[PDB]
Amino acid sequence: NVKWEDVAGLEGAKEALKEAVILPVKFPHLFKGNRKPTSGILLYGPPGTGKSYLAKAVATEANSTFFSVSSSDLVSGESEKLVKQLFAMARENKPSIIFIDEVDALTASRRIKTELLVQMNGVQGVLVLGATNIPWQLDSAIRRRFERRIYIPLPDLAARTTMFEINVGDTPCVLTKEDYRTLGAMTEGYSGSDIAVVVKDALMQPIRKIQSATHFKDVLTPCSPGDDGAIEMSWTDIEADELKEPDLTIKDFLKAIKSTRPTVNEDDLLKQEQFTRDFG
Template identity: 65%
Template sequence: MSSSINFIEKAKELVNRAATEDRSENYSEAYQLYVQALEYFTYAIKYEKNVKMKETISSKVNQYLTRAEQLKEYLDKKQKKTPMAQGSGGATGNGKASDDDEKRDLQKGLMDAIVSEIPNVKWEDVAGLEMAKEALKEAVILPLKFPHLFTGNRTPWSGILLYGPPGTGKSFLAKAVATEAKSTFFSISSSSLISKWLGQSEKLVKNLFEMARERRPAIIFIDEIDSLCSARSEGESESAKRVKTEFLVQMNGVGYDTRGILVLGATNIPWILDSAVRRRFEKRIYISLPDVQARTCMFEMYIGDTPHTLTLKDFRHFGEMSEGYSGADINIVVRDALFQPVRKVQSATHFKKIYGVSRDGKTKNFMYLTPCSPGDPEAIEMNWMDVDGEQLLEPKVCRADVLLSLQHVKPSVSEEDLKKHIEFTNFFGVEG
C-alpha cells in the first residue's frame, strides 16, 4: 500500500468523525477534526503520483476546507459575543482583549526567530561572491553608516533573493549579514510561518513584519522561501493562497512603511517562485559554484590550524582539481581528509617513539608514540589499544590524504541543476 493511500484512509476516517460531530452541532470538535483531515489530505497530494487522483483529492480538500472555514468563522464570532468576566482585565464583548492576547501569543512564538547571539562570520570569511557581498553592503551597511546617501529616489534595496545550488554559501552569507549589520535580524524558516490552524499562517506573516517595523532597522531572512511562496495553481488550497497574498502585501504593499526593512530570501529552486513574489525581490543574485580561487581559499580555511604539511602550492592544486564542487562539498572533502590520520592510527600495526614538548608544555622531553611502517628501524609492534592516551601522536594531514578524499567525495550538484540556474539567471538574475 502506497504512502498516499495510507494518508487518504486516515483523512477519510477523520472526515467521517468530523461530519458526525458537525451533525451533532459539536462545532469546535468538528473543526479540529476537519483541520487534522486536511493535513493528511495535503500529505496525500504531495506523495500521490497519479494526476487524476491528485485532482480528485484537491476537490475534496476544497470542499472540506470551505466547511472548516465556515466553522472557524462561526466559532470566532461566538467567542467575540461572549462577555468576559468583570475584573479580569478583558473586554466585555468586542473581542479586543482576545485579539490582543492572540497577537501577543503569535509574536511570542516569533521571538525565537530574532538572532540574539552574533554568529561571528565576517565578510572576509566568505570566499568569493563579491557581487553578493557588495549588494548586501549596499542594502544593509551603507544606509546605517551614511544615511544622507539614501535620500530622494536613491533608496536601499528592500528585497534581495540569493539563489543557487545547495551548499554554495547562501546561509553563510546571511550569517555574515547578521554579524556585520547593526540591525535586528530575524532568521525564519518557512515552517515557522506555517500553522495547521486555519488563518494562523497569514497572521504569523503579518505579525512578523509588524515586529520588524517596531524594531527597525531590521532584516528578515527567510531560508527555503520557495516552500512558502511557490507559484500559485488551481489545485492550491485557499489557505496557501492567503499566505502568499499576505506576504506580498506586507513586503511591499500599500499602507505599509517598508523603510529600514530588508527581506533576504534564499532558495535552491528559484524557478518555482511565484512571479509576483519574485518581482518583490529587486535584487536576484545567483550564488554560483565557487571558482578556482575561491576553492583554493576554502581548502586552506577548512584545514585551519589542524597540524598539516600542506603548502600553498598544494592548496592551489586542490582548488584546480575540485572543479564542480560546492563549498559544502569541499568542506566534506576536508573533513574526510582530517580523519585520514585517525584511520592510520586505527590500522597501524607498528609505532615508534618520538620525543618533544608535552601538550601541557610542562615536559620538554616527553615521549610520544606515532604510527610507522613495519620496516622502520625504530618500529615497535603494537596497536592503538596498547598506546596510552596522552602518548599518542597522530600523523599530520598531508597532500596524499586530501587527494584520497577528493577521489572518494564526488560533487553533489548535477549538470541539469546548473543549467536550470543559469537559464533562470539569464532571464531574471545577476551573477554573484
C-alpha cells in the same frame, strides 16, 4: 564564520550587496522622494554557496540587526505567529534584514506563504533577503515580492583555498600556505560546501589510521608491517600519553577530494543560467 573582509569571491555580487544593501543603510538620506530604496533582494544560485553566511555577512557590515528563518523549519499548528513575531521584532529594531532561507519551498503552508506575503506587504528600515537554490519553482507572486535579484555562483578557483583554511581552524594539521591553494585548485567545480564535507573526511584520517593498523613505529605512531620498530600490536595497548597521532597532510585532503566527487550538476547549473536571463 565568514567576515565581509574575505567574502569577495562572488564576481559582481560582493559589490551589488554593498550597493544594494549597505549603501542605503549607510546613510539613507539619499533616498528621499521618488528615490525609493530596495524592498526585497532575492539571492538565488547553485546550492552550497553559503548564501546564508553571505546574508549575515552583508547584514553585519551594514550594521543592521539580523533575523533569519528557514522556510523548511517553518512549514514542517501555530507557526503563522512566528512570522508575525519575526517581522515584529525586525520592525521594532532599527535597521534590520530578515533572511528567509529557501523561499522556493514556500509553495499547511499556503497560510505561511500568505502570512509572509502579508508581512512583506508594504514592508525603509527593514530589508528582506530571500535565498533560493531552485529560483524557477518560486511562486509567481513570491518572485514578484523580490525586486533586485542577485546571482551567487559556485566558489572562485581561489575562494576555496580560504575555505580549506577554515574547516580546519582549530583542527591541527601540517598544511602549508600553498597546500591550501593546491587543494583549492584541485576542486575546480566543487561547491563551497562540498569542500567542508571532504574536509570532515580529511580530518578523520589521522585517528582513522590509528584504528585500522597492525604495527606501530617508535619515536608511538602507526606504520607498515616492515619498518624500523614496527611492533605488532594495537592502539588499545598504546599508553595514554605514548600515542603520537599521525600528522594531517595534503595527501589526506587529496584522498578526500578524490573520493568526494562534487554534487553540482553542470547541466543543473546551466538551468539557473536561464533564470538569470529571464529575471536577472
